[PDB]
Design a protein around this nucleic acid. Structure first.
Length: 76
RNA sequence: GGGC
């Protein structure tokens, strides 16, 4: 009863990540460093969308994270 | 499906 906005797959919640010196590998490193499991990541004009577990409550210093309402500005 |  909870699906990724990037994939369709159940068990994910899509977040928008923004911040300075952002890049895919660094983003993935910061998250996994907090012991979070990381699903699909996709780059957008204003940052990255990243899938996380719905029960996870992610706090990562240096980044702003918020549940994505709409997915927009994907580089594709 | 990815480790500054």
């Amino acid at each position: 009863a909870e699906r990724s906005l990037l994939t369709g797959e159940e068990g994910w919640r899509t977040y928008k990540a923004t911040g300075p010196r952002l890049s895919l590998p660094r983003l993935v490193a910061l998250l996994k460093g907090q012991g979070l499991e990381v699903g699909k990541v996709a780059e957008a004009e204003g940052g990255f969308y990243v899938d996380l577990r719905p029960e996870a409550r992610p706090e990562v210093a240096g980044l702003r994270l918020e549940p994505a309402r709409r997915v927009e500005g994907l580089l594709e």
